[PDB]
Amino acid sequence: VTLQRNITLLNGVAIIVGTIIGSGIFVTPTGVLKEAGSPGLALVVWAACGVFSIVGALCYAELGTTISKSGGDYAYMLEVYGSLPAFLKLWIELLIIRPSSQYIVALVFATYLLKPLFPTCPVPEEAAKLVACLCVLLLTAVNCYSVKAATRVQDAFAAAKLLALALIILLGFVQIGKGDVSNLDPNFSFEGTKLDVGNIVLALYSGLFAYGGWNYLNFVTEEMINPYRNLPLAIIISLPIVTLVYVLTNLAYFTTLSTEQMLSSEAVAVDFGNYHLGVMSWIIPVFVGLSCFGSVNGSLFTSSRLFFVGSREGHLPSILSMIHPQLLTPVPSLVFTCVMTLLYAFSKDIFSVINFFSFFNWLCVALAIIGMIWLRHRKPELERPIKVNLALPVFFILACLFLIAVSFWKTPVECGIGFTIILSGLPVYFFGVWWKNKPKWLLQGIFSTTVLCQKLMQVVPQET
């Protein structure tokens, strides 16, 4: 009873494209322009942040084909840094990081789905939390039913958000043809170059938030069809398409609004549709809702497959990593992902985790490439079908430390708090993992609860 190998190339490109293209391209052009001043400097920041992510994606394709085991960026750390510095990543990713980036995206889906009913005013809070909860609870059942269904959902919604962005490119390339060319020729009216250090690097920071999530195909490897060829091929297909589309859409934003119309807005896509449609202008917040509905489906899959793999080693309880036969899906991992996600609907301020999210993100990507170069000498006998020339990691590995320095020195008061939350996973480790031979008051209880959940969900262990 193995899982399967049923993800092709075309189902692999969708997992990356639909997870990168979320709500960043419909919000963050205000922020990068507000911290960059000029349109022409933003239009080159949105390529300088693109090629950086192409470099890091190629290096993760190296690391993925080398260590070809699932739960990537955690299996690549467990092989290198041991048991405890892998439990320290797995403890943060199930408690804070994964069950906040799904609730936030579900909330964005909800508040943009009900946007054509309330314009001059905002949507109600309890009416949007319930739609976010319905968005989570429907997709977890779709994922528990089958895997070939949860791939065809993502295939539809990635193409839906691609058509939605191509609509904006087409509406921009008509206003380019209407000879209203007040920008993009007489440009660089601010140039915003240097306050003391922080004017170009902060635009890079926001643009690098806009490009996130290109390493989720590593979470779903050991489930692809032919992962020795298709894992780098899907990434190489997926990333520069996102780069060119992100450049062309921002170029289409400047031929409609002026700079001050873009800086004081809340959603540049909404003001774009207000200008260029007038009537049938309710299409654009519908498509932003569909674009955030694809990403929750994309993230539940990989979070379930990560907490599956993290229990095969013994870091997590053993009711996780037990497939249900017939409709071979890891049910008690998906149930756990969904419940832990819905637990963050009782927080009244949920957007206050994005800084810790980005800091933890760049720190663990740094740890991974340090481990890759440290292992390339330490075990130079493994089969590497795709081998990368060096100094592509090194230029990436120094710039990751520079980004940790930026994320650390923009708000230290919260990053130290998150460092304490990271350090809070030690007593759980020494109670569950390192303290072998627990007493019979616990070893009967753990086994009986596992048997109870097995008789509830009809699940067998993974033995193939």
């Binding site: 009913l117 005013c121 007040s182 699940v459 067998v460």
Partner: protein
């Protein structure tokens, strides 16, 4: 590995008693999901959709800027139209929306036969320079309003002989200058016009008959309310600047009555709030009241109109050898040629543009708040009672953050005593409000203040702010 295998589970977990309960769990799940959906829809329809945006025009968003004598705006020699094109980045920093240009046509004197409203004076510029000024301001998003009073050099401004020829040449000038591409007109001193009420309606009918994006401004010297309302009988979409506000005013209980009575007599229409038709604020006010009126004119429900130099506190009664209708603008310290040294460093544009406690530093923040927030733009006005000498009012639109303005026109210190007691349930003031700015230095900015022990200093005005809640 910490439980059953496959075969033992297929033994025990295949019996009735264990399959009926899991189908009951599926029934309970798909019954809870539809219950949540029904609760969401019931919460949605039992809520307040939205209000309505009131379809604003361009002169509703910010303030207009009147430039009377063009030679004195920049200086001698370069007192031409193309010189002003080098000044538009200052005006765009002031965030004005309009520019009421002075009268530029050929007018010799009282000879009606050689006043042509279609020909520009050669001492101002040429037609192509005018069109370049227009298109450059259009790229800067500033609209040009052209004054058209014919005799702008005589004593009687409307040519005190017969009226038919001057009325038919003003009418003819509109349909030419609109095709030139201007965005409105201003006619001054209409109390010197014979049957002006029936003439303004014809010009207003013509001006709206080219687009609905066009304006007409009309100016008198009358402070009479019942004479002003007679101009607005058959005209409703007219902007009428006058001397209705000033006239007096060391007390605030009299200014409150003027504002409330003008709004009640008009039926809460769109008005223009200014102190005069061609004069500066310092012609009617002391220097200790320039900030209190600048806070008041940017928050009242209408369009504020200023002349040039009202942002720097310009004063013609401080440097001798100057006309009283056209003072020189103090750009730099080397501006005024005669009496070399009377001009100071806190008197100029460059001198006040770095000091964060000047007049020009207050005008910029106020024009920043006025043209941006939806409460001051098209909100509702409600003034309420206070102590002896306080003008206190509230702007509130729908659900945007409310504004409470408190002004103390008096000279003695006193309490606030904010007894509201009549303000509606959609805008009743809370126990704590923020503080966006103050007219006098000596407070702290951003702090949530309490509206029971609010004390005020002499000649002080406050712009507290609270958001929508219970």
């Amino acid at each position: 590995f910490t439980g059953l295998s496959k075969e033992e589970l297929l033994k025990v977990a295949g019996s009735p008693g264990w399959v009926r309960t899991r189908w009951a769990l599926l029934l309970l799940f798909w019954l809870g999901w539809l219950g949540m959906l029904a609760g969401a829809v019931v919460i949605i329809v039992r809520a307040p959709r939205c209000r309505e945006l009131p379809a604003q025009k361009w002169w509703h968003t910010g303030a207009l800027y009147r430039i009377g004598d063009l030679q004195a705006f920049q200086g001698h020699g370069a007192g031409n139209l193309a010189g002003l094109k080098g000044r538009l980045d200052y005006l765009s920093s002031l965030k004005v929306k309009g520019l009421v240009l002075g009268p530029i046509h050929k007018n010799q004197k009282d000879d009606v036969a050689q006043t042509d409203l279609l020909q520009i004076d050669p001492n101002f510029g040429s037609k192509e320079d005018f069109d370049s000024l227009l298109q450059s301001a259009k790229k800067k998003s500033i609209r040009v309003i052209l004054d058209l009073t014919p005799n702008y050099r005589g004593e009687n401004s409307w040519f005190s002989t017969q009226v038919d020829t001057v009325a038919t040449k003003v009418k003819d000038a509109l349909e030419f200058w609109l095709q030139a591409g201007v965005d409105g007109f201003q006619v001054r001193d209409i109390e010197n016009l014979k049957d002006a009420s029936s003439f303004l309606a014809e010009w207003q009918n013509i001006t709206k008959g080219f687009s609905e994006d066009r304006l007409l401004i009309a100016g008198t010297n009358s402070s009479d309310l019942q004479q002003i309302l007679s101009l607005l009988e058959s005209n409703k979409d007219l902007l009428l600047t006058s001397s209705y506000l000033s006239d007096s005013g060391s007390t605030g209980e009299h200014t409150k009555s003027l504002v409330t009575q003008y709004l009640n007599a008009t039926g809460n229409r769109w008005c223009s709030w200014s102190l005069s038709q061609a004069r500066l604020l310092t012609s009617f006010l002391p220097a200790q009241l320039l900030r209190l009126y600048q806070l008041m004119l940017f928050t009242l429900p209408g369009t504020p109109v200023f002349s040039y130099g009202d942002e720097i506190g310009l004063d013609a009664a401080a440097l001798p050898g100057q006309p009283m209708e056209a003072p020189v603008m103090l750009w730099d310290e080397s501006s005024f040629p005669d009496i070399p040294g009377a001009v100071s460093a806190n008197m100029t544009v460059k001198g006040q543009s770095e000091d964060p406690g000047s007049l020009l530093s207050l005008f910029r923040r106020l024009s920043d708040q006025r043209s941006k927030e939806r409460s001051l733009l098209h909100g509702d006005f409600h003034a309420f009672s206070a102590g002896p000498g306080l003008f206190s009012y509230i702007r509130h639109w729908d659900q945007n953050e409310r504004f409470l303005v408190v002004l103390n026109f008096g000279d003695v210190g006193l309490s606030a005593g904010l007894q509201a007691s009549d303000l509606p349930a959609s805008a009743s003031l809370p126990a704590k409000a923020d503080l966006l700015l103050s007219t006098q230095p000596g407070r702290e900015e951003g702090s949530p203040l309490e509206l029971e022990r609010l004390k005020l200093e002499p000649h002080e005005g406050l712009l507290l702010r609270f958001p929508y809640a219970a």
